[PDB]
Amino acid sequence: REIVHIQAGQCGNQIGAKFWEVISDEHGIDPTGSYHGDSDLQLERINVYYNEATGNKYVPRAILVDLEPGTMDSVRSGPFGQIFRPDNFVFGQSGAGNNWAKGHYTEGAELVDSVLDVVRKESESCDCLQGFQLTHSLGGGTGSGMGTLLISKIREEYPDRIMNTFSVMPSPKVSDTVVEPYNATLSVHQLVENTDETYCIDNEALYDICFRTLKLTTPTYGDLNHLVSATMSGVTTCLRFPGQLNADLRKLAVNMVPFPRLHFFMPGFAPLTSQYRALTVPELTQQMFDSKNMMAACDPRHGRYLTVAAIFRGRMSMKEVDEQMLNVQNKNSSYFVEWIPNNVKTAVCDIPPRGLKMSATFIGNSTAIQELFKRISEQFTAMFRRKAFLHWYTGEGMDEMEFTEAESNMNDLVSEYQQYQDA
Amino acid sequence: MRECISIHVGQAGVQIGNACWELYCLEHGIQPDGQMPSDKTIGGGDDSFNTFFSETGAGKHVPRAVFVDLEPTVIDEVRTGTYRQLFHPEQLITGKEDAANNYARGHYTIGKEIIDLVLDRIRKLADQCTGLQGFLVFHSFGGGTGSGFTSLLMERLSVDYGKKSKLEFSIYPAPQVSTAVVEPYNSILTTHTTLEHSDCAFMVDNEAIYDICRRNLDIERPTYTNLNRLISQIVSSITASLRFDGALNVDLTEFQTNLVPYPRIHFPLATYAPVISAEKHEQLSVAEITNACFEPANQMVKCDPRHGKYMACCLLYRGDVVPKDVNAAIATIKTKRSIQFVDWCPTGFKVGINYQPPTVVPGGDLAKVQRAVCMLSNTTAIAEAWARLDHKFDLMYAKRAFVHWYVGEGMEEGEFSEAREDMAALEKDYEEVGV
Amino acid sequence: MYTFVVRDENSSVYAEVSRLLLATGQWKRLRKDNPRFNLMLGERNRLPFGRLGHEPGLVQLVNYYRGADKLCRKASLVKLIKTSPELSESCTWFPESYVIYPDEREVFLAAYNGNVWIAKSSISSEASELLDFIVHVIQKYLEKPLLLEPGHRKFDIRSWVLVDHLYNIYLYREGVLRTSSEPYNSAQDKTCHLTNHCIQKENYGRYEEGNEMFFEEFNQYLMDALNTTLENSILLQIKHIIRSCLMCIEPAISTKHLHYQSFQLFGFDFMVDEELKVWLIEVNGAPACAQKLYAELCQGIVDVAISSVFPLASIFIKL
Amino acid sequence: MEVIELNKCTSGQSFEVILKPPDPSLEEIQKKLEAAEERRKYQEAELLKHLAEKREHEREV
Numbered sequence A: 001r002e003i004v005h006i007q008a009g010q011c012g013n014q015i016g017a018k019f020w021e022v023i024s025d026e027h028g029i030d031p032t033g034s035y036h037g038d039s040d041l042q043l044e045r046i047n048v049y050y051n052e053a054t055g056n057k058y059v060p061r062a063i064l065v066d067l068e069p070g071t072m073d074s075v076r077s078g079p080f081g082q083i084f085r086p087d088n089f090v091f092g093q094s095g096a097g098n099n100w101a102k103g104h105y106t107e108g109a110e111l112v113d114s115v116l117d118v119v120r121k122e123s124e125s126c127d128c129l130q131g132f133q134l135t136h137s138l139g140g141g142t143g144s145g146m147g148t149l150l151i152s153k154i155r156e157e158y159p160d161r162i163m164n165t166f167s168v169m170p171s172p173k174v175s176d177t178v179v180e181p182y183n184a185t186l187s188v189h190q191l192v193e194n195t196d197e198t199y200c201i202d203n204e205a206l207y208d209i210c211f212r213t214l215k216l217t218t219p220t221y222g223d224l225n226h227l228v229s230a231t232m233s234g235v236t237t238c239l240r241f242p243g244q245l246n247a248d249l250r251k252l253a254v255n256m257v258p259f260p261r262l263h264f265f266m267p268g269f270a271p272l273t274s275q276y277r278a279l280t281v282p283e284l285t286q287q288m289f290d291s292k293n294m295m296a297a298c299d300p301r302h303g304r305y306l307t308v309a310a311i312f313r314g315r316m317s318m319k320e321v322d323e324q325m326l327n328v329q330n331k332n333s334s335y336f337v338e339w340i341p342n343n344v345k346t347a348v349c350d351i352p353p354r355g356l357k358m359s360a361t362f363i364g365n366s367t368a369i370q371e372l373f374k375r376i377s378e379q380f381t382a383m384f385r386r387k388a389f390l391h392w393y394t395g396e397g398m399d400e401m402e403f404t405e406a407e408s409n410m411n412d413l414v415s416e417y418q419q420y421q422d423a
Numbered sequence B: 001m002r003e004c005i006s007i008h009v010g011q012a013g014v015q016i017g018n019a020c021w022e023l024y025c026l027e028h029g030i031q032p033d034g035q036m037p038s039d040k041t042i043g044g045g046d047d048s049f050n051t052f053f054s055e056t057g058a059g060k061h062v063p064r065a066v067f068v069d070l071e072p073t074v075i076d077e078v079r080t081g082t083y084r085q086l087f088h089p090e091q092l093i094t095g096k097e098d099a100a101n102n103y104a105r106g107h108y109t110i111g112k113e114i115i116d117l118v119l120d121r122i123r124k125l126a127d128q129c130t131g132l133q134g135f136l137v138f139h140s141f142g143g144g145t146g147s148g149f150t151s152l153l154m155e156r157l158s159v160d161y162g163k164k165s166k167l168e169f170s171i172y173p174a175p176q177v178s179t180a181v182v183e184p185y186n187s188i189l190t191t192h193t194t195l196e197h198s199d200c201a202f203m204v205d206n207e208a209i210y211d212i213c214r215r216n217l218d219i220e221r222p223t224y225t226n227l228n229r230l231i232s233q234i235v236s237s238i239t240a241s242l243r244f245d246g247a248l249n250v251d252l253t254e255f256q257t258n259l260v261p262y263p264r265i266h267f268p269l270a271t272y273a274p275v276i277s278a279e280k281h282e283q284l285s286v287a288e289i290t291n292a293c294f295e296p297a298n299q300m301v302k303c304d305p306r307h308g309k310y311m312a313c314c315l316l317y318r319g320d321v322v323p324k325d326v327n328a329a330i331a332t333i334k335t336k337r338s339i340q341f342v343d344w345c346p347t348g349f350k351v352g353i354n355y356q357p358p359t360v361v362p363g364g365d366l367a368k369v370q371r372a373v374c375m376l377s378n379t380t381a382i383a384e385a386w387a388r389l390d391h392k393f394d395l396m397y398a399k400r401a402f403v404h405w406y407v408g409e410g411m412e413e414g415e416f417s418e419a420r421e422d423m424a425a426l427e428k429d430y431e432e433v434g435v
Numbered sequence C: 001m002y003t004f005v006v007r008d009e010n011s012s013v014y015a016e017v018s019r020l021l022l023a024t025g026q027w028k029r030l031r032k033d034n035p036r037f038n039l040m041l042g043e044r045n046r047l048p049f050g051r052l053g054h055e056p057g058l059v060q061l062v063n064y065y066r067g068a069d070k071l072c073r074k075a076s077l078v079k080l081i082k083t084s085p086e087l088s089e090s091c092t093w094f095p096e097s098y099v100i101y102p103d104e105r106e107v108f109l110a111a112y113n114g115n116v117w118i119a120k121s122s123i124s125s126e127a128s129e130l131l132d133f134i135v136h137v138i139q140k141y142l143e144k145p146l147l148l149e150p151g152h153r154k155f156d157i158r159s160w161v162l163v164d165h166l167y168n169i170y171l172y173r174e175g176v177l178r179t180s181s182e183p184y185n186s187a188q189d190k191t192c193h194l195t196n197h198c199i200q201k202e203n204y205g206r207y208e209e210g211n212e213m214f215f216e217e218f219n220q221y222l223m224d225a226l227n228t229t230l231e232n233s234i235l236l237q238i239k240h241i242i243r244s245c246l247m248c249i250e251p252a253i254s255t256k257h258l259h260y261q262s263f264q265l266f267g268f269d270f271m272v273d274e275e276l277k278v279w280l281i282e283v284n285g286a287p288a289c290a291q292k293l294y295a296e297l298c299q300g301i302v303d304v305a306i307s308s309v310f311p312l313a314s315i316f317i318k319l
Numbered sequence D: 001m002e003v004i005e006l007n008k009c010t011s012g013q014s015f016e017v018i019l020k021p022p023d024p025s026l027e028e029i030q031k032k033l034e035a036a037e038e039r040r041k042y043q044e045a046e047l048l049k050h051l052a053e054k055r056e057h058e059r060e061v
């Protein structure tokens, strides 16, 4: 039933805050934690993400983590900043300097235990905890380094629970430091082993969407987070509202993950917005599957879909939905592996997101995701063959061997995807 | 009089069980509070309807049923539904987290910690039986609980009730309403482990019910409510012989005697007619509804009996039907259709007639008809459904897709090929009899 | 965009059909084991009919009628004719035949007492030589065949029949005569008694190219020699035989109210005696076509059997 | 085509028309469940052992 949310680092806290802003609006929860909705569908499964405090007030089951206070101070004074449980703010003061080693081994180790104390207090209040949900980036230090450290500690204490992450992948097109490939490669190895479901959110795709599709001349991190917020609300609809398909984290994993390491999902959203003409079910279906709507900069036609989950939101014709989902499957059947029959599952929700009467959310486990890990691997190797910028990491006690092993395992992940792309 | 206990496992079994007991109450005149004005033996009796209903000193007629699901949301609808008064808290069993569409999670991990409770609650019902016949078990093939826990329950029931019969009503998976890609795995795992424990199993393919609802009830997108109310009618037609006075299929043993000459081939094909929309009609005759029993479009499992062989055929009429019209229709049908029996069986039909026409739920999708029929024929053509299922199994298992989910629950990978090998022998058993 | 799969690579007929389907631009070929197809050009043996019509959103069509083997296997055809009231034991256009295993022999011996028979399975005046040879069928050898002149030679007629999903029976207007180049001899040599194309090609090709005489020439011959036409003397009997056989099995193989649809091309082989009476010999369920008729017939298959179910953006006689 | 075994009652009648003539014990179950349980516990012990090796690597760094 209950999900415990964790958001770590600048990116993780900025996207996590927006996530709670959006679903709070969908569930009728105001910034004060009071309900002011017009439907019971909003409250039927609210306990998945919200604890009910005294006075019938709803408090997100969210834990905010960072090694510097800056970004979390802004969240607390943000629009929905007052809804979060004050005790669930766990922050240090030194920062991680965009250094995976600082988040994972030194600065983060000094803070991790206090984070686990908060996780334990939330989990203990769960009638039947089902898993955890982490928002973070892989290019920084705290979300990447301390985030993966938290996952490892959480798995040790709750090894039979599902671990789900929204992981923002770095891109030179939207880069803060040159060491992002190092931090990302080190993190992917952790995620391959210690998560069940990872939504790959590529800042390269988010930028391209804002620039090409939405015609935003100079996208900001806020514009990128608009797309992330919409995607996160879409892929969690089945967890938050009554439904038959992928209604919990474990059933989602069973339907989406045919092999344990291949659990990195390509999300998509339609319609792409930054308009009063509502789409048609055929238009949602085409855009939902269009590469320009994917949040991971990978061409689906360069690979094959192992599994797909589709979520339609709004009042529409279920008959027409099934016809269109069967249409796209029967026309491009070569891009769906034939050794997993009926690998495309579709869910419908009556409540649409704010500002739209109809929307569609895509979740694909495609072998084309290897292009994303290939990109990171090339950027990693270009620096690592000259051992450039490594002193930032050896200074925190890391050895070069650990980098070689992280590189090797991600190249293995790439080859494992290619194995099933030719099956 | 001999009692029958109904067991409903998983979402499918529970929700179908709900629509059945609602229909039973309407057919017997039992009200949502459990009172039965027509029953003059207050607090007791050994009438035919007492096979499914016990009686309290206060006059409440209580189903001999136990509902079990590893998550509580579905059974909670029973606790708060229209017929909440009928059921007794001990009858409704719920767990915390479900089997996640994983046979191994329902059979081993979660089934091991709730099996003793379910049996104890069943024992409470059995202890109220002067002469228990056996059990009717409702479940899905594709669900983790319907598949995994059912197979464990059937194993223990054969231990605790060795001499009692057990019949299945099973929901065969259909992608149009299925919720999991691994449902072929679960279907074959539960069939393997349950085969030696079930005496007679009635499979219902959701694909068939779905199209019957679309084509005959003009429902653009049927829901589980539409499907379950139609399933309730077929189930009711099958169990009517146990709940009303009669001389055909009056005990669970007779189903095996009449429909299953070979123990392993215990999956009779059910065909129902007429299915008429309530929103619509010219009433169909005995010959027209009987002829409709040989149209694939009306079968609970889509297949072609023309290219198989019959081992037994039972016709169960409800409504204005006299034996004269039944034999005039059969004779006409033998001259126009391909009805080949196995050489070692008589080419004939066992016919039962109940004058009470089918009861329809007020506000439902089905129109009241003056006569209906359900044919139960054990034909080898139903093996087409095993072939489909085994093919999908073969595709995924050749790559070991999703297998790690089952091993992670403590199941050995050898049980996959063990269950598949049992299904291979089953398919050839049908082939030997069918040719 | 309609989709289809190919599962009989050794079929010349449907190898041309698929080439035509692709040339339209509205059909896309999938791989053998892709289940999301509209049309299946299936294998000749053990076609998985049970896995058809179970794909939501796809109207599925296959180029074979399940159960049509009853008519296309020699032993089954004999049983079908003698046990079906529609055809009955006293069938005038089928040679007296008996099914015997290495069954029905005591009845063959009774009728035994012209008396030359032929044994076959999928020629001797003494039954002892036939049984010692021997699942097989023995039927009376037609000792007085119609002999073409010049040549004094045997022949048999091949007719192609297409049955669509609605069970419309279409007779291709173009037939072919597999002729023999050796004169018929009333008194072991098979080259003059058997008219098979493979046997003849192993005097071949003298009178007609490839020992294939087509209807225009054969009709002109019947007019010049016997003062009659192919339509009156032979083709009426052929159409009658085709209908009787296919309508007899219609209730068993029809896909009218099935979850999938079937069509099939059939090859009827006939035999004409000197009195211009037509005899049915065999029905082929997987026939080939004459080289010069592949284009016309295969195009007709697409128009009548496929495009009628899957329309895009007459050479047949309807029986 | 003969009718056989005709029985009539107030609520209906039945008959037959012939056209043409012609387990593991409780202990063994408990072992299976316990065997699978031990495999789950062994797989978890291997996980926690593998995570314990990462803990000591973290202290070494």
Ligand SMILES: Nc1nc2c(ncn2[C@@H]2O[C@H](COP(=O)(O)OP(=O)(O)OP(=O)(O)O)[C@@H](O)[C@H]2O)c(=O)[nH]1
Pocket (backbone or CB within 6 Å): B009, B010, B011, B012, B013, B015, B016, B069, B070, B098, B099, B100, B101, B102, B106, B140, B141, B142, B143, B144, B145, B146, B147, B171, B172, B173, B174, B177, B178, B179, B183, B206, B224, B225, B227, B228, B231
């Ligand atoms: N006809 C019908 N089928 C149902 C119904 N509910 C679920 N199903 C089918 O059952 C299969 C899924 O199994 P469920 O019964 O829902 O799963 P479960 O038994 O509860 O097991 P878990 O949820 O995994 O613990 C799918 O193929 C569904 O289409 C129902 O109410 N009616």
Ligand SMILES: Nc1ncnc2c1ncn2[C@@H]1O[C@H](COP(=O)(O)OP(=O)(O)CP(=O)(O)O)[C@@H](O)[C@H]1O
Pocket (backbone or CB within 6 Å): C095, C118, C120, C139, C140, C141, C142, C143, C155, C156, C193, C194, C195, C196, C269, C271, C281, C282, C284
């Ligand atoms: N009862 C009969 N009377 C006279 N001739 C006969 C005959 N039966 C067969 N023949 C001749 O012997 C030949 C044997 O061919 P048959 O009828 O067995 O078909 P087949 O399957 O062997 C070749 P295909 O499949 O290409 O038609 C016939 O072509 C015919 O000329």
Ligand SMILES: Nc1nc2c(ncn2[C@@H]2O[C@H](COP(=O)(O)OP(=O)(O)O)[C@@H](O)[C@H]2O)c(=O)[nH]1
Pocket (backbone or CB within 6 Å): A008, A009, A010, A011, A012, A014, A015, A096, A097, A098, A099, A137, A138, A139, A140, A141, A142, A143, A144, A168, A169, A170, A171, A174, A175, A176, A180, A203, A221, A222, A224, A225, A228
């Ligand atoms: N989408 C998005 N990405 C961000 C944001 N802030 C930082 N990033 C990305 O995350 C990486 C930097 O990590 P960051 O979260 O700032 O460092 P951390 O605080 O140590 O985890 C870079 O690849 C940035 O492009 C944000 O608000 N939105």
Ligand SMILES: [Ca+2]
Pocket (backbone or CB within 6 Å): A110
């Ligand atoms: Ca410090």
Ligand SMILES: [Ca+2]
Pocket (backbone or CB within 6 Å): B039, B040, B041, B042, B043, B044, B045, B046, B055
């Ligand atoms: Ca009573």
Ligand SMILES: [Cl-]
Pocket (backbone or CB within 6 Å): B160, B161, B162, B163, B164
């Ligand atoms: Cl017993």
Ligand SMILES: [Mg+2]
Pocket (backbone or CB within 6 Å): A010, A011, A140, A176
């Ligand atoms: Mg930063």
Ligand SMILES: [Mg+2]
Pocket (backbone or CB within 6 Å): B010, B011, B071, B098, B143, B145
């Ligand atoms: Mg369930």
Ligand SMILES: [Mg+2]
Pocket (backbone or CB within 6 Å): C122, C282, C283, C284
């Ligand atoms: Mg032949």
